[PDB]
Amino acid sequence: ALQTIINARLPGEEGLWQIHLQDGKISAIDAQSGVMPITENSLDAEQGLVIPPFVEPHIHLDTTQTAGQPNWNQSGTLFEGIERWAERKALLTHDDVKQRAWQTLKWQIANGIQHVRTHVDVSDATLTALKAMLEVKQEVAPWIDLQIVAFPQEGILSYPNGEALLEEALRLGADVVGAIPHFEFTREYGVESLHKTFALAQKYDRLIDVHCDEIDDEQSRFVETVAALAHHEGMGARVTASHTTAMHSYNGAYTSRLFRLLKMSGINFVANPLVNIHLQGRFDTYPKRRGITRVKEMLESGINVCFGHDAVFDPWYPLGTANMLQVLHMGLHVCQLMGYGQINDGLNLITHHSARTLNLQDYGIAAGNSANLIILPAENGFDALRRQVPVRYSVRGGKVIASTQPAQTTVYLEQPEAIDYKR
Amino acid sequence: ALQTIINARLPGEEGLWQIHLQDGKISAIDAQSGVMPITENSLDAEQGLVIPPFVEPHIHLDTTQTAGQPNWNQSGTLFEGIERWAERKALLTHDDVKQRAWQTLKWQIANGIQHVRTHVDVSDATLTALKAMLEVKQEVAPWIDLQIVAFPQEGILSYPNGEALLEEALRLGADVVGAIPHFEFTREYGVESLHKTFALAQKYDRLIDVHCDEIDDEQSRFVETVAALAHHEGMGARVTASHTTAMHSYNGAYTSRLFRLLKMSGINFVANPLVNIHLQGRFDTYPKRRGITRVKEMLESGINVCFGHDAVFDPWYPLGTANMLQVLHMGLHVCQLMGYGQINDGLNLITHHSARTLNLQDYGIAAGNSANLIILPAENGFDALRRQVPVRYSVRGGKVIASTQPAQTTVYLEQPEAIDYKR
Ligand SMILES: [Fe+3]
Ligand SMILES: [Fe+3]
Ligand SMILES: [Mg+2]
Ligand SMILES: [Mg+2]
């Protein structure tokens, strides 16, 4: 079994490091004064970057891999996506959900993602997707720790037996309580749904992740209730507000007032760059707003924010390979976090900040933690992001669970020359 | 007594039709293969259009015919209208209300309107106008089925004994419960007033028609509560949201979310083109918004919407002859429903859609229904609208109750020539 990771670079640290492994955990981390020789039981990072696993804080595995079945969304709109999904209803079975969820999970394993939070639609009396996902969670456990959010897609108060189904999902084992206040029939139902959501989370000791204000409506301010209730219950760490795209459209004075509460509450925020840029701003003609939440300002204020892929190869987002560096690339551009340091520190948005959002207790390259880490063939976060590098090795419990042999590019000039896209 | 209506054109149908009458009802409707000869007991539509009666879904008969008494509204503003009305207070008596209401009702009978819903101000401890209108309703019954809305003009919670007076109006026989949430002192009073309105409608088994969001305020969203409460009680068919002019100013994202609820709720919408274009947009300088609700989008979404005249010859609207084709003409222009089909189908906005809004159970040219129909001297809806044709004949219970001999225009060129404005 592997005993050491050598010649490792670490974010924010100078030089090379050696990570000692014992009994599936990191026993010690020591600096090196030079390059160490390879040997049996040593995994050579080759001066590449070693980081804790990538995290997917927000994805919908119940709808993944269904784009084009039976027809393609040709307009690319949300409306048509709903219709295309409805045409596939006859194929939505227990086995179908498991098969598609596993397909995307395999892409995630290949992409060094060892933690995934999936939302599952529970506005279905049969809870078909949920039952399937609970089995998938057990099956994929050796490679990925999967959290399941009971997501009442059609609303809690605006759908028949919505609250009862949400609670049933928790009784069956869902890890997180979801909600969608802006989709409820009225603002009052929206606020009330949040009180019910928090009551359920406290009753069952579960986390909370609300699809919050995902709409270009400057009056959609459910985020203040999410933050206020979290602060009241002293449970900010266990709470997440996903999307909050409406915040992109708030006036600055209200946003400034709100930010004080957001910081005090300690809640987490998830932005989904690939889907937000695609689905937001659809009611604008020109100019067209970007529609991503205030990521830059959150970072400047010390508010925890991270990035999710949201959807992969489905009616609402036809693209994706479940790659977090790709999600990060889109977010840095749309949020204008393009300074060198902002880009370099970007890795935090798909690693540490996301681990905090999932309330993970065993995460990070530190003595005592499980030996879960990945190796990127790049010098730092900036380099990894610029070159969209693959994951050279993914290690879990001190064992390699994924590896990618890099592509080899050659140009034939007066003489053949290898191209690695580095200067 | 009349036995048949011959040579009739019907909207959306090809050719000519014969409508057989018996015992005040339509016994059968048969297609003709050519023009039928006239004869005793046959009313010849002369290839004109036959439709069920025009409907006035929203008018204020308690204030009608008072413009210029004792003074004229010179600015044309809402503010001055209130002052001009106040100067006439000494003339507001039982007999005065009946006289003016009857004057407009006669214009409506002449204009082929057999169904009228009038709002009556019940923010008056003496309920003078209501008592008068209840007598008018009985008196005009042979010609018009009049519905009375108990309209709490000064608010339910914002006026002394407002709720008690609203209920008293229902106990006296008002057919519909009214409300005006945006006029209440606070948003909270607005929402609460709607709960009270729905409770009264269920307690007395009455319809509901709310003066809803008649204001250029993008934050006036009482329509979502009207729709949500209707959906909750499963009574959409009995509910109407009048005006909703604020919807003209909503952002598109919220409107899209709202529309799902509007469709699911099944409630009705009334737009009042002549008054809305006049009174809305008054706080804008330039550019100036139109201020009519989203009629085109409602039609595209299958949401029932129709047109009312609102006011006739009073301080708030000095014009009008209570003519529905004139109301329709204004609405088609302001709502940009100017395609041929949109204009031709326009008749639905002042006939069938309005009948649905009034929850009428005996309406339409169909076997078994009462023989209530009107004949327009035009080829179709487009032609009737373009030429603003009068009602040639109005038939109720199988008897003619109104008729108009068309004007005769002649131009004297090298020879006299009759002009009918057709090409
Ligand atoms: Fe989502
Ligand atoms: Fe009115
Ligand atoms: Mg989504
Ligand atoms: Mg009015």
From Swiss-Prot, chains A, B:
UniProt note on regulation of activity: Fe(2+)-CDase is rapidly inactivated by H(2)O(2), whereas Mn(2+)-CDase, Co(2+)-CDase, and Zn(2+)-CDase are not inactivated by H(2)O(2). CDase is also inhibited by excess divalent cations. Phosphonocytosine, a mimic of the tetrahedral reaction intermediate, inhibits the deamination of cytosine with a Ki of 52 nM.
Cited Gene3D superfamilies: Metal-dependent hydrolases, Urease, subunit C, domain 1
Catalytic activity: cytosine + H2O + H(+) = uracil + NH4(+); isoguanine + H2O + H(+) = xanthine + NH4(+)
Functional pH dependence: Activity is lost under pH 5 but not affected up to pH 10.
SUPFAM superfamilies according to UniProt: Composite domain of metallo-dependent hydrolases, Metallo-dependent hydrolases
Cofactors required: Fe(2+); Mn(2+); Zn(2+)
Keyword Ribosomal protein found: no
Reported effect, residue 153 to A/N: Less than 0.01% of wild-type enzymatic activity
Site feature Activates the nucleophilic water, where: 243
Effect recorded for residue 9 to W: In strain: SO5076
Any single GO BP term: cytosine catabolic process
Pfam family, one: Amidohydro_3
Organism of provenance: Escherichia coli (strain K12)
Subunit structure, as described in the record: Homohexamer.
Summary of the protein's practical applications: Cytosine deaminase is being explored for use as a suicide gene for cancer gene therapy. The cytosine deaminase/5-fluorouracil combined therapy has been used successfully for a variety of animal tumor models and is currently under investigation for the treatment of human cancers.
Function: Catalyzes the hydrolytic deamination of cytosine to uracil. Is involved in the pyrimidine salvage pathway, which allows the cell to utilize cytosine for pyrimidine nucleotide synthesis. Is also able to catalyze deamination of isoguanine, a mutagenic oxidation product of adenine in DNA, and of isocytosine. To a lesser extent, also catalyzes the conversion of 5-fluorocytosine (5FC) to 5-fluorouracil (5FU); this activity allows the formation of a cytotoxic chemotherapeutic agent from a non-cytotoxic precursor.
Binding site for Zn(2+): 58, 60, 211, 310
A GO cellular component entry from the record: cytosol
Annotated knockout phenotype: Cells lacking this gene have less than 1% of the isoguanine deaminase activity of the wild-type strain.
Alphabetized UniProt keyword annotations: Cytosine metabolism, Hydrolase, Iron, Metal-binding, Zinc
Name of the protein this chain belongs to: Cytosine deaminase
Active site residues of this protein: 214
Gene Ontology molecular functions: cytosine deaminase activity; ferrous iron binding; identical protein binding; isoguanine deaminase activity; zinc ion binding
Phenotype upon changing residue 214 to A/Q: Less than 0.01% of wild-type enzymatic activity
Reported impact of residue 310 to A: 17-fold decrease in catalytic efficiency with cytosine as substrate and 2-fold increase in that with 5FC as substrate. Shows increased sensitivity to 5FC
Residues the entry annotates as binding substrate: 153, 316
